[PDB]
Each structure stands twice: as structure tokens, then as C-alpha cells.
Amino acid sequence: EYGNDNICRVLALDGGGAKGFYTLGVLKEIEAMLGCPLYKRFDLVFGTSTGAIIAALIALGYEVDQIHALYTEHVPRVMSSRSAAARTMALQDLAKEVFQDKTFEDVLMGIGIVATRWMTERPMIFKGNVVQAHGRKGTFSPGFGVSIADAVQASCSAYPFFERKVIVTAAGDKVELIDGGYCANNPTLFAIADATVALKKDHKDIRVINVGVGIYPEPWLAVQLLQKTLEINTQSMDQLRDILFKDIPTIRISDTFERPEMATDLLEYNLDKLNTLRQRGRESFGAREAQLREFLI
Amino acid sequence: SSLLTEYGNDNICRVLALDGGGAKGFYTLGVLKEIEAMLGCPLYKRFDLVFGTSTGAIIAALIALGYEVDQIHALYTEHVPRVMSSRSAAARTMALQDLAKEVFQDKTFEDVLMGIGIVATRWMTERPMIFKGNVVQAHGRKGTFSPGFGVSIADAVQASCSAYPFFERKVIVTAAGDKVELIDGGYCANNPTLFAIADATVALKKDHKDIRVINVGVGIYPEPWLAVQLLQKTLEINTQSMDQLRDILFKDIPTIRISDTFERPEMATDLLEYNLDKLNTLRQRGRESFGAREAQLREFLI
Amino acid sequence: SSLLTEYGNDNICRVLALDGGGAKGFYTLGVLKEIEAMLGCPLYKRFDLVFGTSTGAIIAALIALGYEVDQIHALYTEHVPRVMSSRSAAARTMALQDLAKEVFQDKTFEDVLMGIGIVATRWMTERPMIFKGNVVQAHGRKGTFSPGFGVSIADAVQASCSAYPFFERKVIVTAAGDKVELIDGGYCANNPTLFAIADATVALKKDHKDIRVINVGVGIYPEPKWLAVQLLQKTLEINTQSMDQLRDILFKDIPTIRISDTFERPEMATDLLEYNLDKLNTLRQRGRESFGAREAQLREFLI
Amino acid sequence: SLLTEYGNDNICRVLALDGGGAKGFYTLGVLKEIEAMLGCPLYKRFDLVFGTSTGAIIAALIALGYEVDQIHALYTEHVPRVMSSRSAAARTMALQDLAKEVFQDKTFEDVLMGIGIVATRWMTERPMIFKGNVVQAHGRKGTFSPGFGVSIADAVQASCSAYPFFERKVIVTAAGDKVELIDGGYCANNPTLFAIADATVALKKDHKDIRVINVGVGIYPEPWLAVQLLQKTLEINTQSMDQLRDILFKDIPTIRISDTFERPEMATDLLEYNLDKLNTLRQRGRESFGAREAQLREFLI
Numbered sequence A: 001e002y003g004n005d006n007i008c009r010v011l012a013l014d015g016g017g018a019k020g021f022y023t024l025g026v027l028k029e030i031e032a033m034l035g036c037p038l039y040k041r042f043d044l045v046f047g048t049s050t051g052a053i054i055a056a057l058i059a060l061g062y063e064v065d066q067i068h069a070l071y072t073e074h075v076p077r078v079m080s081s082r083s084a085a086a087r088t089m090a091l092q093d094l095a096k097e098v099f100q101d102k103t104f105e106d107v108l109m110g111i112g113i114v115a116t117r118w119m120t121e122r123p124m125i126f127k128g129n130v131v132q133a134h135g136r137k138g139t140f141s142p143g144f145g146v147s148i149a150d151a152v153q154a155s156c157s158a159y160p161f162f163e164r165k166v167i168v169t170a171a172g173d174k175v176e177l178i179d180g181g182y183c184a185n186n187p188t189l190f191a192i193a194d195a196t197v198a199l200k201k202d203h204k205d206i207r208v209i210n211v212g213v214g215i216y217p218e219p220w221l222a223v224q225l226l227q228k229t230l231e232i233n234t235q236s237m238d239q240l241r242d243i244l245f246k247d248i249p250t251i252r253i254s255d256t257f258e259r260p261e262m263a264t265d266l267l268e269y270n271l272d273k274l275n276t277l278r279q280r281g282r283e284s285f286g287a288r289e290a291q292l293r294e295f296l297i
Numbered sequence B: 001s002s003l004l005t006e007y008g009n010d011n012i013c014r015v016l017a018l019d020g021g022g023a024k025g026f027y028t029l030g031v032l033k034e035i036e037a038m039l040g041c042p043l044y045k046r047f048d049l050v051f052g053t054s055t056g057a058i059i060a061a062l063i064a065l066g067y068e069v070d071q072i073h074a075l076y077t078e079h080v081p082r083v084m085s086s087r088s089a090a091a092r093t094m095a096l097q098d099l100a101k102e103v104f105q106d107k108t109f110e111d112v113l114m115g116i117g118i119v120a121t122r123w124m125t126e127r128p129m130i131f132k133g134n135v136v137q138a139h140g141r142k143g144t145f146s147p148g149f150g151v152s153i154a155d156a157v158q159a160s161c162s163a164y165p166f167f168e169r170k171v172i173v174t175a176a177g178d179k180v181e182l183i184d185g186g187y188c189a190n191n192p193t194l195f196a197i198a199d200a201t202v203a204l205k206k207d208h209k210d211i212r213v214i215n216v217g218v219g220i221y222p223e224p225w226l227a228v229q230l231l232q233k234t235l236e237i238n239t240q241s242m243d244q245l246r247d248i249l250f251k252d253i254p255t256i257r258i259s260d261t262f263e264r265p266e267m268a269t270d271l272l273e274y275n276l277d278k279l280n281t282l283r284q285r286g287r288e289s290f291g292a293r294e295a296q297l298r299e300f301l302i
Numbered sequence C: 001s002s003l004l005t006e007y008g009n010d011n012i013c014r015v016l017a018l019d020g021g022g023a024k025g026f027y028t029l030g031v032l033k034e035i036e037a038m039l040g041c042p043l044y045k046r047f048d049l050v051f052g053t054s055t056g057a058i059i060a061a062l063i064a065l066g067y068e069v070d071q072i073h074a075l076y077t078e079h080v081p082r083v084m085s086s087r088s089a090a091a092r093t094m095a096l097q098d099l100a101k102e103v104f105q106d107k108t109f110e111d112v113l114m115g116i117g118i119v120a121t122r123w124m125t126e127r128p129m130i131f132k133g134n135v136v137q138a139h140g141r142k143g144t145f146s147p148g149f150g151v152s153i154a155d156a157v158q159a160s161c162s163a164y165p166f167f168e169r170k171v172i173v174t175a176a177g178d179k180v181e182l183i184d185g186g187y188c189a190n191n192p193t194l195f196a197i198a199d200a201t202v203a204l205k206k207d208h209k210d211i212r213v214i215n216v217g218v219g220i221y222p223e224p225k226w227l228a229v230q231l232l233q234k235t236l237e238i239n240t241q242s243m244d245q246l247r248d249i250l251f252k253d254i255p256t257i258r259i260s261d262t263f264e265r266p267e268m269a270t271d272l273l274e275y276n277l278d279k280l281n282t283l284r285q286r287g288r289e290s291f292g293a294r295e296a297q298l299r300e301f302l303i
Numbered sequence D: 001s002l003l004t005e006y007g008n009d010n011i012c013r014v015l016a017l018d019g020g021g022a023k024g025f026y027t028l029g030v031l032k033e034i035e036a037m038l039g040c041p042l043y044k045r046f047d048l049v050f051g052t053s054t055g056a057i058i059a060a061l062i063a064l065g066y067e068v069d070q071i072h073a074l075y076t077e078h079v080p081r082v083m084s085s086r087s088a089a090a091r092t093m094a095l096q097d098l099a100k101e102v103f104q105d106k107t108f109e110d111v112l113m114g115i116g117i118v119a120t121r122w123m124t125e126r127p128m129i130f131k132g133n134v135v136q137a138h139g140r141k142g143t144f145s146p147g148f149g150v151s152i153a154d155a156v157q158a159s160c161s162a163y164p165f166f167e168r169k170v171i172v173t174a175a176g177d178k179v180e181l182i183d184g185g186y187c188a189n190n191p192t193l194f195a196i197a198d199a200t201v202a203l204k205k206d207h208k209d210i211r212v213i214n215v216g217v218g219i220y221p222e223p224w225l226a227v228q229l230l231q232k233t234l235e236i237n238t239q240s241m242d243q244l245r246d247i248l249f250k251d252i253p254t255i256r257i258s259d260t261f262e263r264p265e266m267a268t269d270l271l272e273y274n275l276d277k278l279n280t281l282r283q284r285g286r287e288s289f290g291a292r293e294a295q296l297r298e299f300l301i
């Protein structure tokens, strides 16, 4: 609506597998209440694994309408690959068709993509502005001089199913990355650290609209431990956020479903089930409609 | 006693956070032995908060009760190595259960002389469980606050030292009769430094210019399937990412970290070490790491 | 063309010492890169003295000749890998001579833009042979002082990098005519921090207060009859470690910063004679990350 | 026999002994001529003495209060017995019977002067310098136990543990720490640069009020591509350290007593055990004191 109001609204998108059709429904009930593309009422856009695709397109062009078509055309196909190498090939073509040649300079709003380094074991975060980092200024090239087609492709590669990406920075050093779900499945906490410390904002200035994908049921003792350890981090990171930044206006939109006919597998290639998740989630906004307009205006 | 220096009260709040790594805690004793003598009094008279983790809780508790370093080292070398020599996973729990009953016989969380906190991980909820000591350190729900959940200070430690693939799972019953399930605290936070500042910043409100953090680890050593490597790889990512977040958020706080990295094939251990001569080498390695930074630690705490 | 900022004169005298490694010099190229862009000017505009051992001698010379860091990195990966690829003592010596011919051929110890010192060990006298630039850096015999023994830089740096077991001893002919035989400068001082300290206290008599010391190493990495072998390895480590312990006893009240980290994981097992550019590329990333921790402190030293 | 008193001036006088093995006899010949010039035990004039692997057995006996005439009696009887044993294991064993019969259960509290003994840490690769007073320490003055609560029979035996011909030794300090040490002739063979530091940063003194006396064993002739290097690098450390000394500490009046011999009538052997050969080394020491008596009289008086 208006131009500026000294209110920094951040957007943290979760993401994983085909279940990202949920947040496409939530984000569909929005951008109509507003009337403008979702980047016209936001200053930061964070996305870890599947919200990274939604993060880019929102940041460099088209609205949700188009995104949905680009998401139902290529994404349901890549999961339908019975080999780990085949999934990596279709993902490369996906990243090559929706992102042809645009890079981190053609981005319209502040964006941060989450990725994990396989050797240093600490997250890599692609940023797009000079005053966005906290240290080591100088030799700071937006997006490491990398193309967006290769930045998102790395941030979507789950190791046990995909292949580990190898990116060639502009400075000439090959980095071996994996998807940003292994370090932060929820970029909410990281998003607070940019507006607070880097952008130098007060503690009552920001409105954090966090959108998720939802919780769903299921269709060697190390395999159980992987699922258990990969859930403690996301929960503990959430609890930590509530203790540190308890005085920040936040709204989390991610509901839990318990019906047996709703259990997914994070890789469901069924257009006759992803459509239902797109529907259940258009109602999850209908319960907080009166509250979200206090944040977006 | 031979430690009689009385330090006057001041407005500065000095925090101490102890890392845990198992039987490799001898590195922590060697470092703390030098810090006490530099002061001249037991550590409970100069520090205002103490947190710990799996093996650091056995040390973090004794510092809060009032024990001196020379007494802590007298017990840490006869009970800790003997439980790591247990073969069966059921034997490592029967042996750890006898440890806390000979060091923390009957005391509770109401007989501590400083701020305390012990980290433990829930299994069902998958969130931390920190055993506070005073209601002033809580972050809500203060109307039903009981120091230490009404749990004895011996069981709060037995739960934090129990790693799942090697120990058993601990079941405690609090005051209100709630059978909670817990495992080692090295899953949610291996370095409680980020948990320690959070408890001393929004609770016990202190500015960023009046806090002195001192993090003492256990060191870094070389190594002595597909789903198994992934497991170890995920754990390192969480630890190396949790402290970087601390560096971004909390960088205006004077902080000193005392840990050392070794690369020789002789200094190769794991968290199952029970060799007396090997552990002794780790002890005198920590004392050397203090002298390199003594010129600065004297400025923080005189 | 990019670095344009200027820094005025001042009384505090800085110093820079570079450890002598091998193919592991890529680690130092990362640390120096971050420091360069941070300052915003070539290093010969802020530092007032630079020492260097075998591998740091190439960098210590190029830094003293006006070259930037983005130019040294090009001249480093272009030739050094060939030097390490050879599998013979005479072959490595020939490549080392071809290297020292193209990077600088017609240059002597009189085009240096700052004060320089290059460490090299004699084979007969068993005392160091430190090539200096000006006469004020000398301690004795100030009646016959040619700035650099009359020797050119092409073979002055070639003598420093002559590890006798894998290379051949270098024979130098000075201006007076003395035929001297030298070996790697890493046999007498693998860390020239102490030597540079002594050259800025007894000569160029600055008090301990106003001396800012910066020592950039190469990092410690794991290793991938046998009695005299180990015992030779231990003797080389004893001299290196004992010399550092002697340093912080006398010159304890001098501000200093040492940037050299340690790694222990098996994927990093870098040793001497490394020629795989893939592993050598990873080390340049580590040195770039090692500066990120001490960036707040180094800003107090260099301003 | 030895009756002479000297006033307590403001000048410190250091004595640094080197190490060469059985060649210590050369040092005794020089000390016999210095004491006789003063007419008093050496501890009443000197304030600090360091040693390394040969001077330990001598610097220890000096700081206790012995006289040179009594040291030579023990040195001539027990030292050549050590080197006579031809085995890497028998030399380390016989070296115990040397310290167990001389320093019979003594500590670093029974000293009348500042002492310092040098050794080498096998695992850490740094020096271990035993001392006997807290005012000679550089930091970590807390938890300072004189001599690490170790006896003198073991601190001396460690500084004479030359790995090629001797075995390693293990040392248990006061705080149950098991350290592994070797000979001290690997980190510093001439303890001149160590003593000057221990008397400048600790025992703060001006370079105008110090007088160092360094005595060695002399340089004598010698009677695979991997051994050559080892013998070369050991003497590149000895050298380049004397040079570092001459550059840093130049305004400190000093005297060195070590003469070079070239004839083939010598036999460089730290493992020497021929009495007629060692008696000659003892004579060259006295012959060397005569050329520098005029100056030693100016320093010691």
C-alpha cells in the first residue's frame, strides 16, 4: 500500500518436498488481501529448502499465480525418479528453466537463502546487499558471484536422496554444499538476527510473519536416531527463539493434521493428494484473517 | 583451607559455562585448577552463575555446593573412569547410578550457594530441560515454580550423563508426579554458552557491558555405513552452527574461550577413554593452555 | 588500480613475519588477502619491515617490490605446482631456477620499497645469512656493507627454498668474490618473528611499547633406519618450539598477533611436496576464515 | 682453608656452565684456578648458576656449598664409570648410582644461591627449567613448588639422558604429573642466553650491573645420508644462538673460556673413559685461565 512506515516486516518460509503446495495456498489467500505482489509489503525474505524457490520468484518478479504454475509443472516430476542421480538431473533442469540467467543483482527485495557446508559444517547464507552482513566486509560480492540457478539448486539437495552440489565462487574456490534443511529448517531465528543486529532496528519495530508447510503422520537403530536428532534441533531452535525474542510480534501459520488419509511421505508425486494439501491451508488463514491485517496493513 | 582472599561485592556479573565431552573432562580440571589459585578463594565466591552439560554437570554441581578444585579432582579420578570401562549398555547405567549416590547423597537444589543450571534433553517433546536453582532465573510460569522440579540433585545429573547409544534412558518423577523421559544433554546443546547468556540477559537483567563469560571446553582431538556417518555429521553441524549464532548475536560481551586443538596421532581419543596415563596427559595439557592467556584472565577477574 | 587510500606517517613501527612452509603457502595468501582489502592499500604502504623464511621469501620479496596480493596468487599457482611435481633432486632444482627467472630476473636488493630481510643458513659456518636492504639494519661491521651482498634477488630467494634432502645445495657468488654454499633458511629459523624483533630493538631503537607485531603462518596439518628419521624430525620441532617459548619471555610487553590455526581431520592431510591444486585450493579458504575471528583486534593494530 | 669475606655490592654475577659429557674435566681445571684466586666458596661471590647435562652435576654441587676440590674427587670416580658401560640401557641404569650416592635425598630448598637446570620435554618439545625460588619465575607464580617438588637426584639424571645412548626418563612432580624428559643438549647446550634472561626480566637488573662468566669443555677434532644431517642440524642450533646472544645482549660484560684444539692428539667423545686422556683435558683448563686472569680479577675481585 503505502511506501514506507518504519516497520520492517520479515517473511520466513519453511519448506520440504512436495508439501510446499500447502504454503502456496496460504500465500494465495495473501497477495489478494494486499492487492500487490508479496514483495511490496516486506523487507526481508528468508527460505531454507523449498521456500527458497518461493523466496527467489517473489524477490525478482511474478506473483503467486505464476509461481503455482511453475511449481506444478516441474516439481511433481523430479520426485518421480527412482534413482538418486536421476533426481539430481531433473532438479538441474528445473533450476535451469525457471531461472535462466538472472543473478543476485536483479533481485528487488532483500533476500537470504540458507545452505549448509559439507566441510566447514556451518551454514552458508546468500545475501544481496552491502549492509546485510555482520563482519568480514571487503571482498563481499552479493551472492558470492554465483547465479541464482545454482544457489537454489544447492539449497534443495537433501544428501541421502540427491547429490552433493559443488559451486564455483567468483573468487575460484569449489565449495561442496547441501540443502539448508540440515542446519535450519526454519529461517525465522536467522531472520531476526539480520534486522536486529545488522540493520540496526529496535525491539518493537518488526512484524514476523512465519509461514510453514504443516505436520502430517506417516504412511538398524541409527535410522531412528536420524529422524529423532533432526527434530530436536528444529524444536530447540524454536524454543530458543521464544526465550530470546519473546517481545517480537510474530504470527506462525502451520497447523497439524491427524487424519490417516492425510499422511504424506515428503516425496509424494500425486497430483490428486497435493491438491488437497493446497486446499487444507486456505482455511488455516481463515482463522487469523482479523489478526494478520494488524501486521501487514 | 589456605584460600582466604575476600573479594568485595561489585556490580559486574561474571558467568562461567562448562562444556561436556565425557571422560575427557580432565582438561577442564587442569584449567580450573589454575584459575582458583590465581584468585585465592573457592570459585563460588567470585562467580554469579554456573551452567554445565553431560560431564560438566558433575563439576558444575560441586562448584555450587562449595567444594574446592582439589576435592573435585579427588573424586573425578576414581568414579568417572570406572563407569566408562563397562561393556554392556545396561552396565554403564548401573555404574553411573552408583556415582551420584556417593557424591550427592541427599542434597537438593535448595542447598546451592550460587546460580546453577543443568541441561538435559527431553525425548517426547524434544526440547531442553534445564534445572534452575532460583525462581528469579525463570522465564515464565513462575507461579508453579519449584527449584529443581523437586528432583534430587543426584538424579538431575544421572539423566544428563546418559547418551542413548551407550547408556540407557532415564525416567524421573518430579514433585507433582510426572514421569518424564530424558537423555544426554549433548543433543540439544553441547556448549551451554548460548544458553548461559540467555539466562543472564533477559533473566537477571544485566547490560552487555557488565558480563564476563568464561567458556572452558574439553579440547579437540583426532579420531582414534551410510546412515552412521550421517549421524555424526549432523551432530557436528549443530554444534558448529550453535556457536556461530552466538558470535553474531552476542559479540559485544567480553568472552574468553579456553579450548585447544591437537593433531598428532598420539593425542587421539574418543568419549570412552579410561586409560589413567592417557587422561593424565590431558590434565597437564590444560594447565599449559591457561598460562598462554593468564595475562588476560587476570584483567577480567582479579 | 583498486587500492587507493593513503595512510599518513606515525611513530609506531609495525612489522610482518611470514613462516616458511611449502605448497602450504596458499594458507598465507588467504590471510593476506583479507588484510589487504581491509586496509585498502598495498602492504608496503603501512608495514615498515618484513622478514621471510623459505616459502615466505617469495611473498616477502614481491610485497617489497610493489606487487599486490591478487598478483602473487597468480604467480604462485602458475609455477609452484610444477616445482613440487618433479620426482628427482636435480629436477626440483631446475624448476626452482626457472621459477626464479621469470617472476624477477634483472632485480637486485636496491629496488625494494621497504625494509626486507631474507633468512638463509650457511653450510660451512652454520650461522644465518640474512639479506638486508639498508645499512641501518646492520649490527656490526659498518665499513663494508653492500646492500644485499651484491647478490641479485633471483638467486637470493632461490637459496632460501633449498631443502637439502629434496633439493641441491645452492652456491652463491657475492660481490667481493666469496663462493658461499647455502641451504634452506628453515634450518635456523622457521619463524622469523624473533629475528625481526631483534632487528627493530637494537637496530632502529624503538622502545618495547610502540612495536606492533603480526605473524602470519601456514597452519598445522596432520601427516599422511627409522631411528635417525624420527630423531631428525623431533630436532627440527624442538628448535621451532623452544625459539617461540624464548620469544614471549623477553619481549612479553610487545603487542603481537599470531594467525595460524590447527586442523586434525583426515580429509586434511597436507604435507610437503603437495601438488594437487584441489587440496591447495581448500587451504586458501581456511586462511580466509581464520582472519574472520581476529578482525576486531587487528583493526586496533593497523587502524 | 678458605676464609675471605666480600661486601654486598649492587652487582649481580652469573655463572653459566656448558655440557659436553665426560669432557667436564676441562671445566674443573678452570674453576680450580678461580676459587683459589678468591679464597672462598664460590656460592659466597656468585648469585646464579645454570647447567646443562654436565654442569648440572657441578652446578648442583656448587649451590649446595661444596668446594671445587671436593667436586673433582666425586667427578673423577663416578663419571667415567657411566660412559664405560657400552649399552643404551646400562648407561641409564649406572647413571642412577651417580646421583643416588651424591645428592642423597636433597630438595631445591637446601640451596644457598639461585640455581637452574635444563632439560627437554619429549612430547611438548619445550624446555623444562628446574629452579629454586619464586622470584625467578615468569608468570604462573601461583602453584609454584620449588623444583616441582622433585628431588635433585632425578632432576640431574634427566638432564643427562642423551636419547641416542641413554634411555628416556619419567618424572612424577608434586601434583602426580608423569612427564617424560630427555637430555638438555637438544634445546640449549650453552645456558648463557637463558641465564641472562632469568636475571633481566626476573631479578630486574640493569645491563650495567651484570657480569656473566661462561665456561665450556672446548672444541676437539673428531676421531649414511640420514646421519650426516642429524649431526649438522644439532650444531646449527648451538651456533646461531651464540650469535643471537651477541646481538641482543651486547652491553653486558661477559667472558667465555673455551679453547679450540686441532692436532690429532685428541678424541671427541662425550663417551670417553680413558683417565690419562681426561687428565690432559684438566691441564688445558688451568693453562687457559692464565691468559684471562687479568680480566677475571677485574670482575670477581
Ligand SMILES: Nc1ncnc2c1ncn2[C@@H]1O[C@@H]2COP(=O)(O)O[C@H]3[C@@H](O)[C@H](n4ccc(=O)[nH]c4=O)O[C@@H]3COP(=O)(O)O[C@H]2[C@H]1O
Pocket: A122, A123, A124, A125, A126, A127, A128, A133, A134, A135, A136, A137, A139, A140, A141, A142, A143, A144, A145, A189, A190, A191, A192, A193, A194, B244, B245, B248, C292
Ligand atoms: N542472520 C544470521 N543468523 C545466524 N547466522 C548468520 C546470519 N547471517 C550470516 N550468518 C552466518 O555468519 C557467517 C559469516 O558471516 P560474515 O558476515 O562474517 O561474512 C560473510 C560475508 O562477508 C560474505 N558473504 C555473505 C553473503 C554473500 O552473498 N556473499 C559474501 O561474500 O562471506 C561470509 C559468509 O560466510 P558463511 O555464509 O558461510 O557463514 C555466515 C553465516 O553462517
Ligand SMILES: Nc1ncnc2c1ncn2[C@@H]1O[C@@H]2COP(=O)(O)O[C@H]3[C@@H](O)[C@H](n4ccc(=O)[nH]c4=O)O[C@@H]3COP(=O)(O)O[C@H]2[C@H]1O
Pocket: A239, A240, A243, B127, B128, B129, B130, B131, B132, B133, B137, B138, B139, B140, B141, B142, B144, B145, B146, B147, B148, B149, B194, B195, B196, B198, B199
Ligand atoms: N537459559 C536457557 N537457555 C536455553 N533454553 C532455556 C533456558 N531457560 C529455559 N529454557 C527452555 O525454555 C523452556 C521454558 O523455560 P521457562 O523458564 O519459561 O519455565 C521454566 C520454569 O518456570 C520452570 N522451572 C525451570 C528450572 C527449574 O529448576 N525449576 C522450574 O520449575 O519450568 C520451566 C522449565 O521447563 P523446561 O526447562 O523443561 O523448558 C525450558 C527450556 O527448554
Ligand SMILES: Nc1ncnc2c1ncn2[C@@H]1O[C@@H]2COP(=O)(O)O[C@H]3[C@@H](O)[C@H](n4ccc(=O)[nH]c4=O)O[C@@H]3COP(=O)(O)O[C@H]2[C@H]1O
Pocket: C127, C128, C129, C130, C131, C132, C133, C137, C138, C139, C140, C141, C142, C144, C145, C146, C147, C148, C149, C194, C195, C196, C198, C199, D243, D244, D247
Ligand atoms: N635480525 C637477525 N636475527 C638473527 N640473526 C641475525 C640478524 N641479523 C643478523 N644476524 C646474524 O648476525 C650475523 C652478523 O650480522 P651483522 O649485522 O652484524 O653484519 C652483517 C652486515 O654488516 C652485513 N650485511 C647484512 C645483510 C645484507 O643484506 N648485506 C650486508 O652486507 O654482513 C653481515 C651479515 O652477515 P650474515 O648475515 O651472514 O650473519 C649475520 C646473521 O647470521
Ligand SMILES: Nc1ncnc2c1ncn2[C@@H]1O[C@@H]2COP(=O)(O)O[C@H]3[C@@H](O)[C@H](n4ccc(=O)[nH]c4=O)O[C@@H]3COP(=O)(O)O[C@H]2[C@H]1O
Pocket: B291, C245, C246, C249, D126, D127, D128, D129, D130, D131, D132, D133, D137, D138, D139, D140, D141, D142, D143, D144, D145, D146, D147, D148, D149, D193, D194, D195, D197, D198
Ligand atoms: N630464563 C628463561 N629463558 C627462556 N625460557 C625460560 C626461562 N625460564 C623459564 N623458561 C621457559 O618458560 C616456560 C614456562 O615457565 P613459567 O615461568 O611460565 O612457570 C613455571 C613456574 O611457575 C613453575 N615452576 C618453575 C620452576 C620450579 O622449580 N618449580 C615450578 O613450579 O612451572 C613453570 C615451568 O614450566 P617449564 O619449565 O616446563 O617451561 C618454562 C621454560 O621452558
